[PDB]
Design an enzyme around this catalytic site. Structure first.
Site, PDB file in Angstrom:
ATOM      1  CG  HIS A 106      41.415  46.308  30.091  1.00 35.90           C
ATOM      2  ND1 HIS A 106      42.783  46.249  29.956  1.00 35.90           N
ATOM      3  CD2 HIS A 106      41.031  45.142  30.655  1.00 35.90           C
ATOM      4  CE1 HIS A 106      43.217  45.111  30.446  1.00 35.90           C
ATOM      5  NE2 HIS A 106      42.166  44.414  30.863  1.00 35.90           N
ATOM      6  CD  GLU A 137      45.435  41.122  49.823  1.00 37.10           C
ATOM      7  OE1 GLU A 137      45.853  40.036  50.231  1.00 37.10           O
ATOM      8  OE2 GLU A 137      44.326  41.573  50.109  1.00 37.10           O
ATOM      9  CG  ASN A 165      45.292  33.208  50.049  1.00 36.43           C
ATOM     10  OD1 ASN A 165      44.288  33.740  49.607  1.00 36.43           O
ATOM     11  ND2 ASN A 165      45.360  31.912  50.258  1.00 36.43           N
ATOM     12  CB  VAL A 175      44.010  33.911  53.781  1.00 35.55           C
ATOM     13  CG1 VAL A 175      44.186  33.621  55.271  1.00 35.55           C
ATOM     14  CG2 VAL A 175      43.473  32.674  53.073  1.00 35.55           C
ATOM     15  CD  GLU A 180      46.491  40.803  54.290  1.00 42.50           C
ATOM     16  OE1 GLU A 180      46.755  41.109  55.479  1.00 42.50           O
ATOM     17  OE2 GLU A 180      46.286  39.634  53.901  1.00 42.50           O
ATOM     18  CG  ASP A 192      44.442  48.825  28.564  1.00 36.54           C
ATOM     19  OD1 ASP A 192      43.698  49.442  29.337  1.00 36.54           O
ATOM     20  OD2 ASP A 192      44.537  47.589  28.528  1.00 36.54           O
ATOM     21  CG  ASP A 240      50.262  34.811  27.365  1.00 40.70           C
ATOM     22  OD1 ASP A 240      50.645  35.956  27.657  1.00 40.70           O
ATOM     23  OD2 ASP A 240      49.559  34.524  26.330  1.00 40.70           O
ATOM     24  CB  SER A 241      49.491  37.996  31.391  1.00 43.11           C
ATOM     25  OG  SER A 241      49.265  38.510  30.094  1.00 43.11           O
ATOM     26  CD  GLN A 298      38.768  37.349  32.860  1.00 50.22           C
ATOM     27  OE1 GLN A 298      37.968  37.166  31.939  1.00 50.22           O
ATOM     28  NE2 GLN A 298      38.730  38.433  33.624  1.00 50.22           N
ATOM     29  N   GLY A 299      42.449  38.180  34.673  1.00 53.54           N
ATOM     30  CA  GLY A 299      42.617  38.494  36.105  1.00 53.54           C
ATOM     31  C   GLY A 299      43.935  39.189  36.366  1.00 53.54           C
ATOM     32  CB  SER A 326      43.551  43.025  33.210  1.00 52.73           C
ATOM     33  OG  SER A 326      43.345  42.292  32.023  1.00 52.73           O
ATOM     34  N   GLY A 327      46.045  44.999  34.144  1.00 49.17           N
ATOM     35  CA  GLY A 327      46.452  46.180  34.937  1.00 49.17           C
ATOM     36  C   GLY A 327      47.696  45.912  35.772  1.00 49.17           C
TER      37      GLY A 327
END
Ligand SMILES: NC(N)=NC1=[SH]CC(CSCC/C(N)=N/S(N)(=O)=O)=N1
Ligand SMILES: [Ca+2]
Ligand SMILES: [Cl-]
Length: 223
Positions: free
Chosen positions: A40, A52, A54, A57, A62, A84, A171-172, A174-175, A177-178
């Protein structure tokens, strides 16, 4: 992640951010040239961001590498989020170091009660919206199969498990995901779905990665 804590810079060196001009999804580096994420999360124009903390920044450490190939599970069903899971191959190999490290795939499924580490740059609010720039972490247990299917009657497949707290508050969201669910140093979960975040009797639903290890290894080996 709602009700977690600041992981610490690079304390989850297998956590990647998927970026298409902004962080949109999490992912897990499983070798120098392959990331596991949610089907998804699929889109064009993916840059994989390793090392990563932040995401707003440049802190040093990175690695920004473009995806060369995305492979959504053949049986991924966007309606039910069954299967999924998605692989992403990097244009070039990640330089592996203490901040950018792979997570081992499962040799077997985890049981209810196993403590897992869920991480991501997702929403930290149950009510409203707040997006952290730094990686958040949550310790949460795998919940009983039975607990999971009672929370989401008719929606949990053998390819899904619940982790978290039926009381809610953790909980997990939105954002996230994956992103990874790691239990005993093995990638057992991918942040898949849920109803709201950190709501009572609405735990997080995760892709059951141990179902996919033969597909992940065959696909990596052939690609
Ligand atoms: N739910 C939950 N536990 N995990 C996941 S991954 C994305 C998602 C949250 S829906 C976004 C709901 C919100 N902004 N609060 N489901
Ligand atoms: Ca950064
Ligand atoms: Cl931590």
């Amino acid at each position: 992640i709602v009700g977690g804590y600041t992981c610490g810079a690079n304390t989850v060196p297998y956590q990647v951010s998927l970026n298409s001009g902004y962080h949109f999804c999490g992912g897990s580096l499983i070798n120098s040239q392959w990331v596991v994420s949610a089907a998804h999360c699929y889109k064009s124009g993916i840059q994989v961001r390793l090392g990563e903390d932040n995401i707003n920044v440049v802190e040093g450490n990175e690695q920004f590498i473009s995806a060369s190939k995305s492979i959504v599970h053949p049986s991924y069903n966007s309606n039910t989020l069954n299967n999924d899971i998605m692989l992403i191959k990097l244009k070039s190999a990640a330089s592996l170091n203490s901040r950018v490290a792979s997570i081992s795939l499962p040799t077997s499924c985890a049981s209810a009660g196993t403590q897992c580490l869920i991480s991501g740059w997702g929403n930290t609010k149950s009510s409203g919206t707040s997006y952290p720039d730094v990686l958040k972490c949550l310790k949460a247990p795998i919940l009983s199969d039975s607990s999971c299917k009672s929370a989401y009657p008719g929606q949990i497949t053998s390819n899904m498990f619940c982790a978290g707290y039926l009381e809610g508050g953790k909980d997990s969201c939105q954002g996230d995901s994956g992103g990874p669910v790691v239990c005993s140093g093995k990638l057992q979960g991918i942040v898949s779905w849920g109803s709201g975040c950190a709501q009572k009797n609405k735990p997080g639903v995760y892709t059951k990665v141990c179902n996919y290890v033969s597909w992940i290894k065959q696909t990596i080996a052939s690609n």
